[PDB]
Design an enzyme around this catalytic site. Sequence first.
Site, PDB file in Angstrom:
ATOM      1  N   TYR C 155       0.809  -1.216   0.000  1.00 28.16           N
ATOM      2  CA  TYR C 155       0.000   0.000   0.000  1.00 28.16           C
ATOM      3  C   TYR C 155       0.850   1.278   0.000  1.00 28.16           C
ATOM      4  CZ  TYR C 155      -4.467   2.372   0.546  1.00 28.16           C
ATOM      5  OH  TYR C 155      -5.542   3.190   0.360  1.00 28.16           O
ATOM      6  N   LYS C 162      -3.372   8.186   2.426  1.00 25.04           N
ATOM      7  CA  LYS C 162      -4.542   8.000   3.304  1.00 25.04           C
ATOM      8  C   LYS C 162      -4.429   8.697   4.640  1.00 25.04           C
ATOM      9  CE  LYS C 162      -7.399   6.053   0.404  1.00 25.04           C
ATOM     10  NZ  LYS C 162      -8.521   6.828  -0.168  1.00 25.04           N
TER      11      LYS C 162
END
Lengths: 257, 259, 256, 259
Positions: C155, C162
């Site tokens: 990720y 995020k």
Amino acid sequence: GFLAGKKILITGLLSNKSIAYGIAKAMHREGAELAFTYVGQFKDRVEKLCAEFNPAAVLPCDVISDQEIKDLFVELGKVWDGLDAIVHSIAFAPRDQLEGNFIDCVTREGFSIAHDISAYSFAALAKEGRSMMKNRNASMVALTYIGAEKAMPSYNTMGVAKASLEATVRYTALALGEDGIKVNAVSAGPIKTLAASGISNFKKMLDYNAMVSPLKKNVDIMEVGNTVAFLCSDMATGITGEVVHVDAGYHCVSMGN
Amino acid sequence: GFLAGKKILITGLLSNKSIAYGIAKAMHREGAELAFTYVGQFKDRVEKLCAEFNPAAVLPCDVISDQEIKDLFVELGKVWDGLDAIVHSIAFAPRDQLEGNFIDCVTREGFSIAHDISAYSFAALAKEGRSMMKNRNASMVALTYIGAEKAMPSYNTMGVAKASLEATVRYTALALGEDGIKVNAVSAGPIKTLAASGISNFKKMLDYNAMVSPLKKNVDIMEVGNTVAFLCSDMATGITGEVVHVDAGYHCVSMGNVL
Amino acid sequence: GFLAGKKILITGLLSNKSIAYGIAKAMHREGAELAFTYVGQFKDRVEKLCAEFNPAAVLPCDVISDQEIKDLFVELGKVWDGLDAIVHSIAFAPRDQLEGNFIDCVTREGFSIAHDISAYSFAALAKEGRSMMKNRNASMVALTYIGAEKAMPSYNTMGVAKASLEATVRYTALALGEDGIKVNAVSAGPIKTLAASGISNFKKMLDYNAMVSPLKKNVDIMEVGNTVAFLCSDMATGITGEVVHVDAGYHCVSMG
Amino acid sequence: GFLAGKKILITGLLSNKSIAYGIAKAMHREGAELAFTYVGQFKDRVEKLCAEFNPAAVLPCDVISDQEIKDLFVELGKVWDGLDAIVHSIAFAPRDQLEGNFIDCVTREGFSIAHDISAYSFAALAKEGRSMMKNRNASMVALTYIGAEKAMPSYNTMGVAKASLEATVRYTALALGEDGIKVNAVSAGPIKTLAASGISNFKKMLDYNAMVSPLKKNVDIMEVGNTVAFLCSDMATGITGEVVHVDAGYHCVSMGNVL
Ligand SMILES: NC(=O)c1ccc[n+]([C@@H]2O[C@H](COP(=O)([O-])OP(=O)(O)OC[C@H]3O[C@@H](n4cnc5c(N)ncnc54)[C@H](O)[C@@H]3O)[C@@H](O)[C@H]2O)c1
Ligand SMILES: NC(=O)c1ccc[n+]([C@@H]2O[C@H](COP(=O)([O-])OP(=O)(O)OC[C@H]3O[C@@H](n4cnc5c(N)ncnc54)[C@H](O)[C@@H]3O)[C@@H](O)[C@H]2O)c1
Ligand SMILES: NC(=O)c1ccc[n+]([C@@H]2O[C@H](COP(=O)([O-])OP(=O)(O)OC[C@H]3O[C@@H](n4cnc5c(N)ncnc54)[C@H](O)[C@@H]3O)[C@@H](O)[C@H]2O)c1
Ligand SMILES: NC(=O)c1ccc[n+]([C@@H]2O[C@H](COP(=O)([O-])OP(=O)(O)OC[C@H]3O[C@@H](n4cnc5c(N)ncnc54)[C@H](O)[C@@H]3O)[C@@H](O)[C@H]2O)c1
Ligand SMILES: Cc1cc2ncn(Cc3ccc(Cl)c(Cl)c3)c2cc1C
Ligand SMILES: Cc1cc2ncn(Cc3ccc(Cl)c(Cl)c3)c2cc1C
Ligand SMILES: Cc1cc2ncn(Cc3ccc(Cl)c(Cl)c3)c2cc1C
Ligand SMILES: Cc1cc2ncn(Cc3ccc(Cl)c(Cl)c3)c2cc1C
């Protein structure tokens, strides 16, 4: 040494595998004067074990007892004028609270005892050691585990108690900080100690930690010890209410393949 | 309604100010069938109060007692085949545990009672309700407070208990999830209820919250109620082990513009 | 319906797998009037796809462009008087940012781009939608992922973005709340969507999640959409700057 | 000294109030060998300032430039064989990002610049320093602020950038830990430094911290310094991906200003 002269009480020394032992090694190396407690039966065990640290006192304290806690400080007060730190490194829940399904296993009494010994006891030490610790940059440090923050298999009622412990640490930090006392917790990675030998698949928890952690290793008692030592020094006087993870980075990852 | 048919037990209804009253209002509105508990003395108070929700059962349950909790589910099982949700909305600590300095005031027995009633009781309701709740997308919701996460003046022992309540919520979520049972908490901002009347400067806590919160207001029992109701619906089936702050945004600020 | 009358703009609808699609289904079911945006190329794709929600408008908006954002609100304001909610459901980072070792792969421009589209864009919708949203219990909801809170394999740069998103949600909640606008984020468990197809071992992430989660399942777009819907309702007016995990309990366990 | 022999690079030293100054003081007292970077204009300022630490090198490094970062390690590698630690103590956002309402003030470019300098630059140092730091229990420490976790007045764009910096720290920890490199952050309480002099009511923020913190005082550069020092020692080898709050306990209280 960065703890030269400091007078520090260590609870929970039980074997030379104990996190307390690593704490003791690290503080002795740093010039602290140490005192130790033990639970009834283990008087001889403990005196032998900690004789190498040249202890100023070795005294009974079963934290189930308000009286014994009270007396711990009366006696300790005969030997020392003030107290610079208390290290809380004790935990307990009945065997039945600690494997299988949390809801099947949890009981009213077992929940009660685990909190009593594993959490309330920290505030009780704080309550009774308070006056010896006033205004000398004193410190308290409790030992905690990530099962406080997350639901894990097995840890169960101890997880809930460690949660209580961490809240106690913060309420205590708030309550004692006017006296200049700092209060903090170290959240250790899993370590093969006597407490660990209750848990049937412990070697696998260890292996999983080492695999999934960023540092790809297990922590040892000296890593923890040294951290507790530091949190009892003048160098940490800006830190209170805090949980420092000493866990090879386990806390910060999710989904290690 | 989004709770139509669902059979939900609500604990902790005590006045029309109670958060449980807001929960009851919201669930009745949404078509839930309701059952309530009371502690010994307050039988008449509570029956009068919750009559408007056409309850299927109004039963004694003092969570100090393992027996009473067990009988609660026996009696309820006579009226209902399954149970869809338990709403836990009870707390207690002795008066002495709740103001002044944490360390001066904390006692072994007070610490004990606070945890027993505020935290253990959640797992105890779970333990006994579990079989009625198996495999029907059932739900549990506890009420909590941000004193669980941060040290606050006064809250003291209840803070510690609330931290224990929140851990219990997560461990219960993990333990009951294989039965499809979802377990969460709502963290309410402060609201002037009977429990709040113990605290001597409460109006000022309310006023501070309203000043500091991003939404510049105090939450009410309908905001909380509606959230609890949501967490007991088929719409929340992806949510568990969670704490949902219903506090006008209090939890997410620090140090407003007025110091 | 608990969104009856409310006028909501939904970004990020791309396929019928999109989380935006689940959000759209849920809000339409609840009586909302919907509007949608799309990026240049996908005009026809998206118009077809969301026709079933009887949209008041379907408009271009590439959040790389300040002008397009501005014009989105000009055009929307020609159709509606006020706006009840914005749903932000868009992310992007270059392919190279998204597998292997974080440090090997992260680049200055890729870091930049991921934050520009994934995070900055949220505040930019807020900035421009603000005056349509004043004083009607309005709402914004962003979609986020636990890769914000924890380091995860793969990720990488999106996790960093995020985390930037989540903060931008809090500072936005603080900045907009004096206008009665509530701002929150729903943190979704993994779902097989077009964005997911970038990731080579995704089926295994999914399987792990379902194994390790307390609820022993994977979430779907309706569970997410239902929550997004709720966070846009009058029922949720006590909630802001919050992250609600819709992930079958994954966030709350360790070592399972 | 607990850093005896260790070769540590310190960024961000600008005045004798800098947090980097306190970190440098601490690490010199613990026997570290020190190197420093500066931004273009301030060459003479910084050489004079850090001369008392007997630096092995004083080198230009504007973290806007990948080339300068690269060249910093090339030059440093001419002086040292390996590197033990990197201390990242640098932040920036344009003036206009930093007071007033977040949404009125945030701009696309200002957001970008704040993250580039305040966040990306940490991974950039990591990227280029990685090979000199392989397999010697090396360390990285970044300075962060609680504005990352919570929304605060004024901090705005920097808060969002700090949030990004803390994630970068965690992803960096996971990516460099196979080389034995530990990576952590210290979350300092507010301190009156050159960066602080941009903020118009800073004295009040300080005063509020001191009032509301458990320890009833403001942290100083030595408290922060010593903690950074420790996080670069052999004693801290079990710690990574961590944020340590050195803020006189500010982070753990709530509603500490209500009496
Ligand atoms: N072992 C792990 O993997 C691990 C991980 C994280 C945290 N911890 C914690 O570290 C601490 C120290 O434990 P350890 O691992 O060194 O195990 P250990 O078994 O050596 O220590 C447990 C200690 O608690 C003491 N104790 C039990 N009841 C007591 C009472 N009533 N009064 C006073 N002392 C009492 C025992 O004498 C013992 O010293 C515990 O708080 C434990 O939770 C252990
Ligand atoms: N009032 C607030 O500001 C606030 C804020 C955050 C969270 N909460 C939580 O909401 C819950 C309900 O609180 P409230 O605010 O409505 O106050 P309340 O006084 O109306 O609710 C207290 C309830 O606890 C019950 N109770 C106490 N001891 C009990 C026992 N031994 N067995 C069974 N029931 C017992 C009482 O019957 C009563 O219904 C509590 O969990 C409280 O912590 C309240
Ligand atoms: N898929 C998962 O497992 C998962 C998990 C958690 C959170 N999310 C988040 O949910 C959101 C919705 O995406 P999804 O997963 O449903 O996948 P998706 O591929 O359907 O959504 C990606 C969307 O972002 C939009 N997009 C990309 N660049 C854009 C730009 N420059 N301007 C405007 N729009 C742009 C695309 O049109 C597309 O609609 C994302 O923000 C994602 O990060 C997804
Ligand atoms: N000051 C506080 O109250 C406080 C609190 C928490 C964290 N911090 C953090 O500590 C660090 C040090 O802050 P400080 O207060 O010492 O301020 P300072 O102004 O003394 O140092 C800030 C540094 O960032 C450096 N810098 C700015 N742009 C740069 C660039 N483009 N390239 C290279 N270096 C650049 C500056 O030269 C300066 O050395 C910052 O990350 C800051 O956000 C400060
Ligand atoms: C009472 C008690 C306290 C403890 N504190 C730490 N540990 C070690 C441990 C680490 C990881 C796991 Cl999953 C488990 Cl179950 C135990 C303890 C064990 C016992 C029995
Ligand atoms: C037992 C009990 C539980 C409660 N749970 C929430 N409240 C309301 C409250 C909110 C904030 C503060 Cl700081 C305080 Cl002191 C009380 C409770 C009050 C009592 C008496
Ligand atoms: C740009 C972009 C943003 C995204 N936001 C969420 N996802 C999907 C996802 C869910 C879980 C995991 Cl573990 C991973 Cl690695 C990815 C994204 C994928 C892409 C390509
Ligand atoms: C670029 C930059 C980074 C900083 N990191 C901390 N500070 C000082 C500060 C501390 C607390 C608060 Cl609430 C505020 Cl608003 C500022 C910085 C200032 C600047 C200019």
